[model samples]
Target: VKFIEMDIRDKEAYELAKEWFDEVVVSIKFNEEVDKEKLREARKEYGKVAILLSNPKPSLVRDTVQKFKSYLIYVESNDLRVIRYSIEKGVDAIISPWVNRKDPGIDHVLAKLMVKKNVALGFSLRPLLYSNPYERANLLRFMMKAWKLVEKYKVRRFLTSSAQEKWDVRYPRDLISLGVVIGMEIPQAKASISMYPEIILK
Candidate 1:
């Protein structure tokens, strides 16, 4: 597995990374303070870059979708409002915490909306790290709940991260195994890694 250093704004670094790694995720800082031109440059490199809009604002979301037009975009946050807005703005996919404990009915609604719009969905499993010991089991349980949603909604994608320091990245296959234990078909589980933009564009 090749590791591409994360630095979305640096074109030189990106070009250099492309020479060695098949795929790279270019993370864009997306608050009201973001630089649109930089994002545009990143989008121009679309097939070689998987744009990760970290902590985006609604206005930024609008701008990105309007400008980038057809490139793949991935948005992630703990906030549902941001996730909802990203989906509405035509993001290719969204990554958020597992949806097990809360009423999944709302999640189903959004997933259905995404399906109707052809938007992809990805739920995160890393928040368990911060939970109280007693609440940790609920983390996996919630992940299983999310798995059911993935199957039920036919979610188009999945991504797993340790959500820790850079050195803590988890093996993609290990995460896929957890997905399988939660009832994801082997093909679907594999697709979680295989369908990643970094893997595909590279």
Candidate 2:
């Protein structure tokens, strides 16, 4: 299993990641203001990078989209509104959790938009880590429902992450196979898992 370390706000950590990994995952933490120049520098330093926007203000998302050009953007489930807006604004992709109580309708809306735009959509299964047995059972049911939705909507991309410590993460291959069990075809599942890089070299 390979791991990608994400420290979107730390320059030192970003530099360290370049030495250890082939790809780097950058999480733009909301409320922690971004340094555009620094970001540009990091991008120049590491050619392969994926940017995860966590609870970003809409303006920041828009600006990043314009600045980054072709890089993939990851939007957390909590930032559904921002993500929807980003998609309309031409984001390449979005990443979010599979289950959330706020607005199930948004999922369909986003799915449809993704299909229309040909933009990739990914669902994060990180929430499963915090679930208790009963919660897990309920989550499993929800997972089935979501999988059906993905199939029905023909949403081709799906993503999962540890969202915490490295030791807690699942192997990418194992996760890809599990996605297949849920309904994603082998190639589709592989594509989703392959979206994120394991290192970012300088």
Candidate 3:
């Protein structure tokens, strides 16, 4: 499955995604200050797992976790301390923690916490698809290091296209292939795209 955006009238975007993925989750950011009623309204529409994006503030993160228990809470910051705080408080997954960072973002301490709390480590293929070759190289290095920790610690993990547009959506097998290229064993790679996500949503 992948995170995606679509026009309200554009069923075509969802249809195109259905062709590529067995499941698709729409990403909606908690863009402003957190508001309970607004969140309830959005949650009511999707009903299933809606991708709720958040930032690095520890208290704000805690509040979201407390309120949006079932929605998939995705923290989108690279601050290691905040990452640790989010996991400890119980967010569903941390999205692409490797982005724009010198390290893979999943250090040993955080890795251990993630396993204990059962927070999923997320890998987004968006940067690989859109970045320049040089940036791709840096991102790959970080991803590799992060993958090693995931394997060594057996941290729960998942992969997504993190698609912003319909064309950015990719076939699940394509994502699985990329997972293997990143040093995941075939079964684990397949799980990142398939099994792991099912575990996250449920």
Quick one: best TM-score, which candidate?
3
Candidate 1 residues lying further than 4 Å off, grouped into runs, are: 1-22, 37-47, 78-81, 97-106, 129-132, 162-164, 196-202
Model 3: how far is 152 from its true place, Å? 1.1
**lDDT (CA) for every model shown?**
0.57, 0.56, 0.73
Model 3, C-alpha of 198: deviation from truth (Å): 1.7
TM-score computed on alpha carbons, candidate 1: 0.68
What ranking emerges by lDDT with the best candidate at the front?
A: 3, 1, 2
Worst 10 residues of 1 by lDDT: 1-10
TM-score (all chains, Cα) for each model:
0.68, 0.67, 0.87
Off by over 4 Å in 3: 1-15, 35-45
Residue-wise C-alpha lDDT for candidate 3, range 99-133, written one tens digit per residue: 87788988898999999998988888788989999
Q: Write the per-residue lDDT of candidate 1 for residues 13-117, one digit (tens) a residue.
A: 445444544454555545554465666676666544446677777887788777765455677655677777777777776755443335332268777777666
Question: Which residue pairs clash within candidate 2?
Answer: 21-199, 21-200, 22-199, 22-200, 23-199, 23-200
* lDDT tens digits by residue: candidate 2, 104-187: 324576778866765555554556667788766666665656666666776655455434544334455665766775667777
> Higher lDDT: candidate 1 or 3?
3
